[PDB]
């Protein structure tokens, strides 16, 4: 049975990858859903106006080409694969000051409806003036995320909620979160889309 | 003699043939219909740094991982009584066990080579330096600071990867005697948790270390 | 229309295969077949100015544009595809280098180019660069001035020529709360004669005048 | 041209026409000789109890599968090749605190008797309390090196001398070397019956005056 | 058409040299190689008196010649030279002997090959090396030195030479924290008591002081 279930999974992976994606186009556009889980504000450097965040970046999209019928593959409804084995979106912070550091494996989960969920943990340094962090009102910084090379005609971006997930925020961080929002923005001949991460924070008093 | 020389060549041939049969002739990872149990254990070697400016602590440890696969089994009698072999971890599937609250990418300090035994068991023990979220307030006190970090599969839920420990006591037999920090206690405990992100329970091992300035 | 989508992917896959697999990699420019690369900078931030080492760290987007006959197609042969995105590793890219960096440049963005059916390519890497700069005067009204040349490392002006669209650096994305304010930022094509080499190299000289924000 | 052809033929014969060496085993064990040449103690950090060393690590071993008759190859007696082209031992510091950094090319010299000499230059941070370094008596630290995954029944270790080579130690280092030894140790765990082998590098050092 | 034939000729040349020959196995006693080395010092970035490490930025010019890289330009549309990734060809294992961190490469690594088989390769590098900067804040300044040479080849396999013993200072950064008093690059033949073979290095000696 286990031999058969393994064989089924190997067969599924082969048919989807080997017996056949060039990325989205205006004729075949994709929607990427983005969500942040903020874990920690590690450092806020007033000498350079750089702040360092650690977060999980949840990315989800769906491809017709990743759809299968579970009945054809021993009731398998999902599988895991290295993110290097599939196309992934070029979602980038627009105002980072150092290359993003990847903290987790980079493995995606593919479901039989064609949906892909990819949640890399990252540490990001970005442009931020932390003046006011030691006051009741705190400091506010923001950073936009979006595709580097695809317009809104090829990749639409969206959020499921504008409330950043703070359920995993480190309780003993040097900084307390007053608010954290993630808001889709459209800028205008093709539309350009980003998600603006806005964090208000202050010294844990 | 020549016989002994031949026996060495045969031994090499048998090992090359075993590795070929296991890897070349014939694992896509665990599934709900074939879940895998990974045993984890930590050997803490040193608390290198406890940074109160950022609430990051840096640990050096060996992370022992064990699992067993039917697909790595062989009969030693078919292979010159070979009972185990060493192979680059890149040659086999390995679990995606990750710290949940690191603050910098984990750094690997050792070769990444696994030992595979004829019963299909694998043992893999990478040495790592990890920076993780920890408030070291109280490190300059009798009772010390207490920090914790969860380790588990990144992408497999408890439907596919289960974890276990052999003991809840961290191996402190190799702890650096002249570290800046002395260890008061170090435990490793399996936990089953749900996250609002996702409907399936994930398993982790929670490493909890209580330490103070020496 | 799910089939029109399938047809559009097939057409793009076929185009890329034709340009990349059923055609051999462009060997780079030569004196018989020189290339003009258009360069433009968008300065985002002066992050750090180190007076102990005389190094300054910039974050910028470097726009590169060139055109190759070998990347041309007829859109009518490929379902009216007029352009596509592809990893910059799939195509030749120019070896444009800062001539006075003090650390390897760090890439901040995906390295993906846009190729258009007339054979034109646009590639816009975001970078952090440390370069040689004495920031003396940064704490004064007149500020500090530093300069850095960008150009091909190995191709002379007989092989790679450069041009700009304007000599004004794009400051429309400069971080408003930077520690440093920009007084001026220019980008100027130069023909550079080096005593080592009989052929001159073309560069774009980026000159930035800046001061500590008030 | 014939000398070049002879060498290309030798390498092809050794690397293409004859099987892989799969590493040592209980039935085909290997002796690895280790020696250190200490070049500099760069940094001794008393805030973290880490010391940084720069050294050359000489490794030697011999394989029947790397032997040839020079007479068959225009009297070539040795050659140099990328260490990636051949099996190399997984010799590791046991108490490093950062990944070792390689400072040189990693190229092995193979001799016709099957012996291999591989001498990477390395910078290593390791666990060390430098207390006493600002005293006449100095500080003492130690680090063990050995195979990560092979027991003494698969890889034995040996030194040619127990004196660390100090002939290349940097004359204007912040630290002077009082002594440096490299000593083979055999330990037996309760886990297992086979012996486990390391070479313990012990350095006594003090701030230069 | 002229340009298509020129590209075709170049693609054919590279194919013939690389794709269609057995890889050059490096020099030997019977087929020794001369490598010419020269340095262009661009900046002393940092001089650390707490660890006695100094950081230099320099261009390292390397030139050698291989018969296996020769061609008759008449057979290839009169192409006389080309540029190629340094990873496409053998390069000499020239290394600093007293670095303290891995050298960092600042430029592309692309070589120029000429029809006579000569190769020119000039990587820009940042190097940290062992240096006591005592005296840097004095009129006499400090003096440091670092040897460069093959890691594994003797003087009977790789000879090193310089064209000049004067380091190229023409591109030295005029506003560096440190000014250069002198910089020389001297070929040295070293013997080791083990072995009768000569071993060759180029000793880079820099005298410098705070500007
Ligand atoms: C690769 O390396 C091998 C090993 O060195 C070379 O083989 C040797 O080649 C030399 C040169 O031809 C030979 O030297 C000659 O030896 C003769 C004696 O031969 C017998 O005794 C020797 C020594 O015990 C035995 O090893 C050998 O098997 C024989 O039993 C001498 O009579 C010769 O002297 C005369 O010739 C020289 C010039 O060559 C004159 O100057 C002298 O004055 C005199 O007239 C000579 O010394 C040697 O025998 C070979 N040794 C072996 C083991 O074969 C290869 O030639 C070398 N290169 C190549 C391409 O193979
Ligand atoms: C030269 O590049 C720019 C200058 C500006 O002043 C503003 C935006 C961009 C490009 C951007 C912005 C962020 C999304 N990515 C790009 C981009 C655009 C085209 C190709 N590659 C990248
Ligand atoms: C966006 O993801 C999360 C938000 C939370 O608030 C808490 C946990 C996770 C996911 C985790 C926890 C770490 C181990 N695995 C995951 C995960 C789950 C699914 C896919 N990839 C990663
Ligand atoms: C030895 O090389 C140099 C010495 C100098 O004093 C100044 C400049 C260069 C090279 C340069 C400068 C322009 C960019 N490219 C080169 C170059 C020249 C030849 C080969 N590779 C790189
Ligand atoms: C969990 O591993 C250990 C705990 C201890 O308390 C002591 C030693 C080791 C293993 C070591 C020590 C260093 C050499 N290699 C190993 C090892 C042993 C087996 C497999 N992989 C690595
Ligand atoms: C352990 O090796 C040495 C000890 C010393 O005290 C001095 C020199 C060397 C080797 C050197 C010198 C630097 C260049 N390369 C070698 C070398 C020699 C043999 C194999 N690999 C490297
Ligand atoms: C190259 O030069 C030679 C002689 O100078 C000439 O005969 C030949 O036709 C020229 N062109 C080509 C493409 O070989």
Set out the domains of chain C in order of their start, with CATH numbers: 1-214 (2.70.170.10)
Structure tokens at A183: 């808001």
Residue in E27, E5, E4 with CA at minimum distance from that of residue E160: E27
| A92 Cβ neighbours under 8 A, 6+ residues apart | A145, A146, A147, A148, C108, C109, C110, C126
With residues binned 3-state (H G I as helix, E B as strand, rest as coil), the percentages for chain B, rounded to 5, are: 15, 50, 35
Q: What is the DSSP string of A66-105?
A: EE--GGGGTT--EEEEEGGGS----EEESSBSS--EE-S-
Q: Is the CB of E78 under 6 A from ligand 7?
A: yes
Closest in C2, C108, C110 to A64, CB measured: C2
Chains near C with 3+ CB pairs less than 8 A apart are A, E
Distance in angstroms (rounded) separating the CA atoms of residues D83 and D107 = 5
Model resolution, angstroms: 1.8
Query: For chain A, percent helix, then strand, then coil, each to nearest 5?
Result: 10, 50, 40
DSSP A109-137: EEETEEEEEE--EEEEEEE---TTTTSTT
Minimum CA–CA partner of B106 in chain A: A103
Q: Is D160 helix (H, G, I), strand (E, B) or coil?
A: coil
Cα(D139)–Cα(D174) distance, integer angstroms: 13
A112 is in an annotated binding site: no
Positive or negative torsion for Cα D168, D49, A47, C185: positive
Measured between alpha carbons, how far is C107 from A93 in angstroms, rounded to an integer? 12
Query: Other CB atoms closer than 10 Å to residue C1's CB: what's the count?
Result: 7
Distance (Å) from CA A40 to ligand 5 centroid: 33
d(CA D139, CA C192): 55
- What distance in Å separates the CA atoms of residue A92 and residue C61, rounded to the nearest whole number? 13
Q: Is B77 helix (H, G, I), strand (E, B) or coil?
A: helix
| Sign of the C-alpha dihedral computed for residues A166, A172, A173 and A176 taken in this order | positive
Give the mutation target among E6, E10, E74 for probing the ligand 7 site: most ligand atoms within 8 A of CB: E74
Planar angle of CA A103, A106, A108, nearest 5 degrees: 140
The rounded distance, in Å, linking the Cα atoms of B201 and B159 is: 8
Backbone angles phi, psi at A73, to 5 degrees: -130, 50
Residue whose Cα lies nearest atom 7 of ligand 1: it is D71
Breaks (C-N over 2.5 A) in chain B follow: 26
Q: List the Cα angle B149/B154/B160 in 5-degree steps.
A: 115
Distance CA D183, CA E179 (A): 47
Instruction: Give the determination technique.
Output: X-ray
Residue E170 beta carbon below 6 angstroms from any ligand 4 atom = yes
Query: How far is B15 from B2, CA to CA, in rounded Å?
Result: 20
- Cβ neighbours for E19, distance < 8 A, ≥ 6 positions apart: none
User: How many Cβ atoms sit within 10 Å of the Cβ of residue E117?
Assistant: 15
Q: Is C179 on the interface with A (CB under 8 A)?
A: yes
What 3-state DSSP class applies to D3? helix
| Cβ of residue C137 closer than 8 Å to a chain E Cβ | no
Note whether A37 and A53 are within 8 A (CB).
no
Rounded Cα distance between A116 and A61, Å, is 5
Give bridge partners of residue B198 from the DSSP assignment.
B195
- Rounded Cα gap, residues E120 and E111, in angstroms: 6
Question: What does residue B166 show for φ and ψ, rounded to 5 degrees?
Answer: -80, -35
Nearest to B111 among D95, D97, D149 (CB): D149
Look at residues B142, B147, B158, B124 and name the one whose alpha carbon lies nearest to residue B58.
B147
Question: What are residue B168's phi and psi, to 5 degrees?
Answer: -90, 5
Cβ of E79 within 8 Å of Cβ of C53? The answer is no
CA-closest residue to ligand 2 atom 11: A148
State the count of interchain CB pairs (< 8 A) between D and E.
75
Report yes or no: B182 and B140 within 8 Å, Cβ to Cβ: no
Pairing of strands C106-107, C112-116: unpaired
Q: Which of the ligands is closest to the CA of residue C112?
A: 2
Are the C-beta atoms of E103 and E125 separated by less than 8 Å?
Answer: yes
D37 Cα to the center of ligand 5, angstroms = 26
CA distance C166 to C183: 17
Closest ligand 6 atom to Cα of D58: 1
Name residue D115's beta-bridge partners: D62
Sign of CA dihedral D169, D171, D173, D174: positive
CA of D171 to the centre of ligand 6 (A): 17
Q: Output b/e per residue, A123-153; b: 16+ Cβ within 10 A.
A: bbbbbbbbeebeeeebbbbebbbbbbbbbbb
Taken in order A66, A70, A72, A75, the sign of the CA dihedral is: positive
CA distances from C181 to B123, C142, C148, C199 (A): 57, 11, 18, 38
Determine the Cα angle at D57 with ends D54 and D58, to 5°. 150
Burial of D155-171, coded b for 16+ CB within 10 Å and e otherwise, reads: bbbebeeeebbeeebbe
Nearest CB partner across the interface for D103, out of E24, E99, E153: E99
E77 touches ligand 7 (CB under 6 Å): yes
Category of A138 on φ-ψ map: left (φ > 0), alpha (ψ -120 to 50) or beta: left
Interface test with E, best of D17, D42, D102 (most E CBs within 10 A): D42
Q: Say yes or no for a CB contact (<8 Å) between C85 and A23.
A: yes
Cβ of A25 within 8 Å of Cβ of C8? The answer is yes
Of B8, B13, B180, the CB nearest to D48: B180
Place of tokens 């005056």: D209
Handedness of CA C171, C172, C173, C179 (dihedral sign): positive
Which H helix or E strand runs over D43?
strand D30-45
Please give the structure tokens belonging to residue B63: 């992370």
Residue C196 contacts residue E39 (beta carbons within 8 Å): no
Please tell me which residue of chain B has the smallest CA distance to A160. Answer: B197
For residues E186-206, one letter each, b for 16 or more C-beta atoms within 10 angstroms of the residue's C-beta and e for the rest, the string is eeeeeeeeeeeeebbbbbbbb
The Cα–Cα gap between D52 and E69 comes to 43
Q: How far is A70 from chain C (nearest CA, A)?
A: 21
DSSP state of E13: H
Within a 13 Å sphere around the CA of E208, how many CA atoms are in the beta-carbon half?
A: 28
Q: Are residues B152 and B204 in contact, defined by beta-carbon separation less than 8 angstroms? A: yes
For tokens 């720069």, the residue is: D54
- How many CB atoms are closer than 10 A to CB C147? 15
The candidate with the shortest Cα–Cα distance to A33, out of A74, A61, A5, A68, is A61
Q: Is E168 helix (H, G, I), strand (E, B) or coil?
A: strand
A31 in contact with C, Cβ within 8 Å:
no
Q: Which one of D59, D87, D148 makes the best mutation probe of the B interface by having the most chain B beta carbons within 10 Å?
A: D148
Name the token pair of B174.
């190799």
Q: Does ligand 1 have an atom closer than 6 angstroms to the CB of D75?
A: yes
């Amino acid at each position: 049975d286990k031999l058969h279930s393994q064989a089924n999974l190997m067969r599924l992976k082969s048919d989807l990858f080997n017996r056949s994606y060039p990325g989205p186009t205006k004729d075949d556009p994709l929607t990427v859903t983005l969500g942040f889980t903020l874990q920690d504000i590690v450092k806020a450097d007033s000498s350079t106006n750089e702040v360092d965040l650690v977060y999980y970046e949840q990315q989800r999209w769906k491809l017709n080409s990743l759809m299968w019928d579970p009945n054809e593959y021993g009731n398998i409804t999902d599988f895991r694969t290295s993110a290097a084995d599939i196309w992934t979106p070029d979602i980038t912070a627009y105002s980072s000051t150092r290359p993003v550091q990847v903290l987790s494996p980079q493995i995606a989960v593919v479901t039989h409806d064609g949906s892909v969920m990819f949640i890399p943990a990252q540490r990001l340094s970005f442009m931020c003036d932390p003046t006011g962090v030691d006051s009741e009102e705190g400091a506010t910084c923001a950073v936009k995320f979006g595709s580097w090379v695809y317009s809104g005609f090829e990749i639409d971006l969206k959020t499921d909620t504008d409330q950043v997930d703070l359920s995993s925020y480190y309780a003993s961080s040097k900084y307390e979160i007053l608010s954290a929002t993630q808001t889709r923005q459209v800028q205008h001949p093709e539309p350009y889309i980003d998600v603006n991460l806005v964090v208000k924070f202050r010294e844990r008093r």
